[PDB]
Structure 1
């Protein structure tokens, strides 16, 4: 239609062991669409989310991020692809030896930003997730559903064009999982697509978002 943010054509991903993680995945996602990527355990859910970030390269087909083809993206341009992609995993990748403030301020230092610029954005980002007045404590002494809230805060910093959630809230309570999902909806409202991959049954059943149902590497059925 317009400028499809994410677009697969005939993407396949066969690993060095000779087994098929994906087979003929074809879909596109509009700039603002929120979708769920469900499927069983052995289906290429996190494999699909890996190709978007450029962590892994497809064995066939093509991938279009924004307007640029990233099928054979050069290794020099990869770090600038992931700067527009927010990445949240099942577990937080927090650096537990360092304060939350700097642990959230990492992406701005990566891109290169003023010291005072960093102060303003991380304070705002720590406020949208509702975790201000927590910037001085270390990740170890925050509670379990509170470390993940920083992981979203780190991702949302630098205004990513897309959040890729790889089974978030997999080790979170049902009451906490809904809160995280209301957070993702908060970002999706303004301008940013979401591709939350998940296993939860009562989380996708309460929302009317597009569901992508991977099954042995085959992507969409409905």
Structure 2
């Protein structure tokens, strides 16, 4: 599958443990919510997926390739596949929106014309094409979050990880953001969402729900 865990567990330096015997399987095209409590281990699970922090007990398989002990030099090649959306909508206030959305395409050298066309297509898909030349500051919060999502997805990632994207938005815009994510899922991009809002997940029961309680994953 697009990601798998085999008896993976993690213990921090202090001795507090985020994840214990968590096991789940994800098939290409499926979407998951990964519900949990204020504590539990939702963020850590996302960090482990993209190799920001290494595990201790089990093994991680991305596409049949072990990520348990990936050498530090090969991490960037893995991260290029995975796109990440964070709650803080990390953006560079100095640069323009078009520059922020084009950073993943410039990390690997690409011709400027292709960058222009691809960024234009992505912003058109997210509806921010009009304000492509504006600074992030002038945008509203929802627009900044959509710019972040566009920057995450611009590079055709196989797996998209979102860490509470709707933290700083009222319920009205939550539906819009979740429908944008559903459109991306329809496109064929595997998505693993992460949130603690029970109402939002209960709204849509089509997608399988995994509950992470005190480091244990019922997967029901």
Q: Which interval holds the TM-score relative to the shorter structure?
A: over 0.9
**CA drift at 1:202:** 2.5
2:93 is aligned with 1:103: no
1:136-191, Cα deviation, whole Å (9 max, x unpaired): 11111100111000000001111000110001111101110111111111111122
Helix, strand or coil: the match of 1:140?
helix
Three-state SS of the structure 2 residue aligned to 1:69 is coil
Q: Work out the CA distance in 1 between the residues paired with 2:126 and 2:192.
A: 19
Q: Unpaired runs of 5+ in structure 1?
A: none
Query: Residue 73 of structure 1 corresponds to which residue in structure 2?
Result: 70
Whole-Å separation in 2 of the counterparts to 1:221 and 1:96: 39
Q: Which residue of 2 aligns with 1:148?
A: 145
Q: Distance in 1 between matches of 2:20 and 2:138?
A: 43
- Out of 185, 189, 193, which is 2:190 matched to? 193
Aligned residue in 2 for 1:91: 88
Corresponding residue for 1:212?
Answer: 210
CA distance in 1, matches of 2:127, 2:218: 35
Aligned positions of 1:43-62 closer than 5 A? 43-62=40-59
* 2:210 paired with 1:203: no
User: Structure 1-normalised TM-score?
Assistant: 0.96
Normalising by structure 2, we get a TM-score of 0.97
**How far apart in 2 are the matches of 1:201 and 1:142?**
29
Cα deviation for residue 221 of structure 1 reads: 4.4
State the Cα RMSD in Å: 0.9
What is residue 165 of structure 2 aligned with on the other side? 168
